[PDB]
Design a protein around this ligand. Structure first.
Ligand code: NA
Lengths: 99, 8, 276
């Protein structure tokens, strides 16, 4: 009766340290639609993150894109934190340039 | 262009 | 060269937190062109595509009227569905619908769609004939008999064969520079050692539109479906999409693997290998 979200964290453009880009967290395949998504910079919530309009795939599972401008560096760590009824605790997925 | 939906 | 117009509607009750939220988002292929959200603070400006701007305020008014009526209809439908399933007033429930049409490169109707789901489960669908219904259960049979009595299929058919096709064709014309442009994937292969013994080959597709794409790995020319990790196609935020496919290969055997890419924007399909 419920479907847990898939989560991908990635950049809009190929990551280049020092160059402005967009950080994306795509949550998909979930049901029901209630969901909480944060983007993190060094463990802390990024403010004013925007998101797409609630839609779904032809199998009825919901998807949302959360996004914010960011300038990647060697040291800064980014991640996406997701909560949904199917999750006992928030799930954190780290941004990895190679994914 | 949207469609008028019907009552279920 | 084929295209689709589709509306994806979600109505969700929230007892104790006001009336059910209704949101309808309209797409031409993978381009959202309209949104109506009953929770939006100021409509407008709810987003609309550029090539929608030229249609004028009467067009906006008409669509807004339909969305507002749909909001009420879906709220009443949610009340009916609660009863059909003997459900309590305490829980949240979700009614979703998809409707619209597919056309070919010549703009002719391929088929229409009008179907629903309740709480994530298929509920009722207009059949491809645009005349008859398929109901999933005894609750949806109630809807089916109501829709049969009111000759609803006939109304849906008129929209799907008429309005839907005529407006999709218009949008395609007016938005031809984007809607009828396929952007091919930019592709490359990366190599990621796991151990002394094996490494991941990851084949990337970036910057493509529309979202439909085929990305596969072969070993010695044989499909590696079972051994390939294929992530879901994902939006970049600039209208384009991204995808990758990965295989784990034995050290030194990388040249036996080929990545294959098909997409509407490519003059011809790609074959790629790791290039160290
Ligand atoms: Na709906």
């Amino acid at each position: 009766i419920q479907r847990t979200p898939k989560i991908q964290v990635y950049s809009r453009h190929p990551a280049e340290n020092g160059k402005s880009n967009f950080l994306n967290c795509y949550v998909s395949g979930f049901h029901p639609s209630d969901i909480e998504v944060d983007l993190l910079k060094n463990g802390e919530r990024i403010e004013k993150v925007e998101h797409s309009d609630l839609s779904f795939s032809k199998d009825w599972s919901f998807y949302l894109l959360y996004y914010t401008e960011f300038t990647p560096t060697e040291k800064d760590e980014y991640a996406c934190r997701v909560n949904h009824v199917t999750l006992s605790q928030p799930k954190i997925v780290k941004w990895d340039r190679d994914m | 262009r949207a469609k008028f939906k019907q009552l279920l | 060269g084929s295209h689709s117009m589709r509306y994806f509607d979600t109505a969700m009750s929230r007892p104790g937190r006001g009336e059910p939220r209704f949101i309808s988002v309209g797409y031409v292929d993978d381009t959202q062109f309209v949104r109506f959200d009953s929770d939006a603070a100021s409509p407008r400006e709810e987003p609309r595509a550029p090539w929608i701007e030229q249609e004028g305020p009467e067009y906006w008014d008409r669509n807004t009227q339909i969305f507002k009526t749909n909001t009420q209809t879906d709220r009443e439908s949610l009340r009916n569905l609660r009863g059909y399933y003997n459900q309590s007033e305490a829980g949240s429930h979700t009614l979703q619908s998809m409707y619209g049409c597919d056309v070919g490169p010549d703009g002719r109707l391929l088929r229409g769609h009008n179907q629903y789901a309740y709480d994530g489960k298929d509920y009722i669908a207009l059949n491809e004939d645009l005349r008859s219904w398929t109901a999933a259960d005894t609750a949806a049979q109630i809807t089916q008999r109501k829709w049969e009595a009111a000759r609803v299929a006939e109304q849906d058919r008129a929209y799907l064969e008429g309005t839907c096709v005529e407006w999709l064709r218009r949008y395609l014309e007016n938005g031809k520079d984007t809607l009828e442009r396929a952007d091919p994937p930019k592709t490359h292969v990366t190599h990621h050692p796991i151990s002394d013994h094996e490494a991941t080959l990851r084949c990337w597709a970036l910057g493509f539109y529309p979202a439909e794409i085929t990305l596969t790995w072969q070993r010695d020319g044989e499909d590696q479906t079972q051994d390939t990790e294929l992530v879901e196609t994902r939006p970049a935020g600039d209208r384009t999409f991204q995808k990758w496919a990965a295989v784990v290969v034995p050290s030194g055997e990388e040249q036996r693997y080929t990545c294959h890419v098909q997409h509407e924007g490519l003059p011809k399909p790609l074959t790629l290998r790791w290039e160290p």
